[PDB]
Amino acid sequence: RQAQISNITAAKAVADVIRTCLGPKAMLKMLLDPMGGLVLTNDGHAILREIDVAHPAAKSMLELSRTQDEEVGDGTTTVIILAGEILAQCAPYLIEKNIHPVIIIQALKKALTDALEVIKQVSKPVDVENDAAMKKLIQASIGTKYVIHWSEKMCELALDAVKTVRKDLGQTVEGEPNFEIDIKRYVRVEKIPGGDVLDSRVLKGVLLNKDVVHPKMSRHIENPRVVLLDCPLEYKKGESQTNIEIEKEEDWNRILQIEEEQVQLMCEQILAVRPTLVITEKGVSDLAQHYLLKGGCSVLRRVKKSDNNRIARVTGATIVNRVEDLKESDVGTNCGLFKVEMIGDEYFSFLDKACTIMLRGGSKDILNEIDRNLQDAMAVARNVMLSPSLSPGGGATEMAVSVKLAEKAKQLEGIQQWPYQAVADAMECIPRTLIQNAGGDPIRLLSQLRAKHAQGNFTTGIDGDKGKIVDMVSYGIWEPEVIKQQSVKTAIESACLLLRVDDIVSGV
């Protein structure tokens, strides 16, 4: 039984320390490094990565914080604390009460479904098509930051950034696509120095800094066709050992003729479909410029490989290695704008749910702070599109589950009834932790808040500024439901995996 105690105390020791990292009132922390420096920030994601742990259960809790931080911007410490308190309330039941661990694990799976149904009933509908309403939802992640001066412009910039990647489609034929929204790859941004923040627009496509390779060429094409390829256009060499030795004076003209033929033969493979544009991943020699000039196509070299995957979304061209294998299905037809016009003293290109957002600002240092601030702001707006529902903040959602769980568990009359009381106590520790940081009495404010759920609604939370029981809806405190769904599901799933290991094997 000592191994089960070590598994609980390993994850709880990490959760008990980060209890002060929750909420806007979160107290700062100080870690002692061997170097003279120290970590003054209260962010839990930065503190947990610098903490050295021994027992492997704490290592599994660190990997959970990395995955949770990628989905949503905030709420990282909420998942770790919630997963650690469940093991604390189940500690006397697993040891003293001698309850089998799978019974606790099986009960947590049943309580996970009931916890999600209560949150959906407490949540209220919200209009996702209102542009003025989405700016206020993002504003919670805007204010109290360096972007507060641009907050008026940041709400408009973050709005169009989310509206670009999202597309509303649904039906009962092919199922629910869930909009297929990815912040990492698709919403990936490229910071360009110069320009203006208000004039900054979101372009759909891939943006390249390479201009036309010919001095006189048409800068506007009606129906441009983007074509992707791998092997560059240039003089090739033999795959085996090649010995080139020029002795006679007339032998120099043989290499000059072969060099012109090898480039021309590679262009004939592209000209089969007669495309309006030629884009090469690698560089292009100057010999291929005159051959493709009469064909009515522009040559574009020096294209990254990672950007070719996003071009297939706006075009459809399939990546092909050998130039002879290029299919005619790769045409770039129905391209909106070909304009190459320079903006901000840098030559651009227009290829317009995948794209590269062009960021412009007063300097590079200004755009650096906007980077991490815009990514965390779009995570809140992404949760709004996953479902038209909002949840009360300040711990009201945490209290709504504990009230309905204790009343429903009494009607089941089974062995799982006992651990349900431990879950309800763990759900109340999240808002109670903010009470200990708010200066109020944790004993008095916990009993008075729980009694109001039986009379009033479940949307009444705790305010950090005041410290007394107040309504979250009337005073303008809201949080998305997706964070509440990911906080309950991932904490229960991670807590069950820690109880499945009854022995620690030492070996390679």
């Binding site: 309850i99 009494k410 009993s447």
Partner: protein, 524 residues
């Protein structure tokens, strides 16, 4: 954090009492420093034979002795319940709840429990004092102590109680049943089936005379003489000595005619029994053989008190004054062989109803012989609880009482607003130790019997009136079973006077421990 360690010190002794209550209970052998081994199953008696180190333990010991003095039953219920109230209060200390509101919460929950005890009464004891009616009260007392003897000892104890009680009804002014009316004696040899019920005290000693027993005559006169048998002399000194051989014939024959003259006047008054509390001379036993007077010597003054209340005899400070007004009367006395040895017992027939009885026990086991002796004494005080203070009312036992209170206490928890809700909820959970102790010591699985106990008292009935069976308690099993069974089949009940008195004592016991935040000690 000594207040937390103080519970751990009691927790070490808590598991000792958890192995006491229930049929799995067992006596504990304790060897005193004087070379005497005291063996008893009762936990309250063991507390006096144990050396207490921490002074906080004596608080629960003093509260346990209160249960044995007054009601005489429920000592295990007080100590176990008081120990569980500290465990549920330990979580409130770590939670941050002050111990002041914890004490106030128990006072509000105690008054709510006492008001619900009147509505939980099922049957009412008519106080008929019938042999079959007393079997319902005595059965649970013998139960959870010694197994297999509950059927044999039920008829032996219930028969001795009806002998000392007169015929009366609806009268509580004059008390009748005392705690000394039932005496337990032991003898080597025999079995429990051969044991009988005697209407009076039983003497296991020898008569020390040639007269084995008296006749069948009605109303035998019994006289108790505190003065020893000897010639009357000066009270101060008066040692008989022989200066010369001439006075030897006068002093020897003088004491023979003086003693015979006093015994002749006693025999003429009709006194066939002489009780001498002091030693008896050699020449005194010779005259009592021809007159047919039974010789009895009782040096213990405690046995003479219960003897005067039966026949009516009175101790005489002098010798030779047979006052007929103070003499006792017994219907019949006989000397029979019980248990392999011939002894002179004391019984009655019709008149002069005895107020004290004695049950003779027989068996081949020495360990179980002293265990039954201490077990019957617990059943003696059960008859005393039949008086006016809620003697007729009874509540179902076998763990059914503590489980049923869970639904009623939790209903009043949400009704009372404020911080008192934390102490009310923990007050009902503390009653779960009683069903868990009986289920764990019996080898039954916690995942099986325990969830069935909650579903027994909590069901969904489409109506306001309760129905089905609320009498299902905790079953010991031991062979096989499915779910639980009805307690009304075995007729195991608990009196209200015993249960109600155990609640107030256990409440004040845990209140004292939680109220003490500091302990000062000094080495001796």
């Amino acid at each position: 954090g000594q207040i937390i360690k103080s519970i751990a010190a009691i927790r070490e002794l808590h598991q000792m009492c958890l192995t006491s209550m229930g049929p799995c209970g067992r006596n504990k052998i304790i060897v005193n420093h004087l070379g005497k081994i005291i063996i008893t199953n009762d936990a309250a008696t063991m507390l006096r034979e144990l050396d207490i180190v921490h002074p906080a333990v004596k608080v629960l010991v003093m509260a346990t002795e209160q249960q044995k003095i007054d009601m005489g039953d429920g000592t295990n219920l007080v100590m176990i319940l008081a120990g569980e109230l500290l465990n549920v209060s330990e979580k409130l200390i770590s939670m941050g709840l002050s111990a002041v509101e914890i004490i106030q919460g128990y006072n509000m929950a105690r008054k709510f429990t006492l008001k619900e005890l009147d509505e939980m009464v099922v049957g009412e004891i008519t106080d008929k004092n019938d042999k079959n009616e007393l079997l319902k009260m005595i059965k649970p007392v013998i139960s959870s102590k010694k197994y297999g003897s509950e059927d044999i000892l039920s008829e032996l104890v219930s028969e001795a109680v009806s002998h000392v009680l007169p015929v009366a009804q609806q009268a509580g002014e004059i008390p009748y049943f005392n705690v000394d009316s039932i005496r337990v004696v032991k003898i080597m040899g025999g079995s429990l089936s051969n044991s009988t019920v005697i209407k009076g005290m039983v003497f296991n000693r020898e008569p020390e005379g040639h007269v084995k027993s008296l006749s069948e005559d009605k109303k035998h006169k019994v006289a108790v003489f505190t003065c020893p048998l000897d010639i009357a002399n000066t009270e101060t000194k008066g040692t008989v000595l022989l200066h010369n051989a001439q006075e030897m014939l006068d002093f020897s024959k003088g004491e023979e005619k003086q003693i015979d003259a006093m015994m002749k006047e006693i025999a003429d008054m009709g006194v066939e029994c002489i009780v001498a509390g002091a030693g008896v001379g050699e020449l005194a036993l010779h005259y009592l053989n021809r007159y047919g007077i039974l010789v009895l010597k009782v040096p213990s003054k405690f046995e003479l008190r219960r003897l005067c209340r039966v026949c009516g005899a009175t101790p005489l400070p002098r010798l030779g004054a047979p006052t007929p007004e103070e003499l006792g009367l017994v219907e019949t006395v006989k000397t029979m062989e019980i248990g392999g040895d011939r002894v002179t017992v004391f019984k009655q027939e019709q008149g002069e109803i005895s107020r004290t009885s004695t049950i003779i026990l027989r068996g081949a086991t020495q360990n179980n012989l002293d265990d039954i002796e201490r077990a019957i004494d617990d059943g003696v005080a059960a008859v005393k609880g039949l008086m006016k203070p809620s003697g007729g009312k009874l509540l179902p036992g076998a763990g059914a009482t503590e489980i049923e209170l869970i639904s009623r206490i939790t209903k009043y928890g949400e009704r009372t607003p404020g911080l008192l809700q934390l102490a009310i909820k923990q007050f009902a959970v503390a009653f779960e130790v009683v069903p868990r102790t009986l289920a764990e010591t019996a080898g039954l699985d916690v995942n099986e019997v325990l969830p069935n106990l909650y579903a027994a008292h909590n069901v969904t009935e489409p109506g306001a009136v309760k129905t089905d069976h609320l009498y299902k308690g905790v079953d010991i099993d031991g062979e096989s079973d499915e779910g639980v069974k009805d307690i009304r089949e075995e007729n195991i009940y608990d009196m209200l006077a015993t249960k109600k008195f155990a609640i107030n004592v256990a409440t004040e016991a845990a209140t004292t421990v939680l109220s003490i935040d500091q302990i000062i000690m000094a080495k001796k």
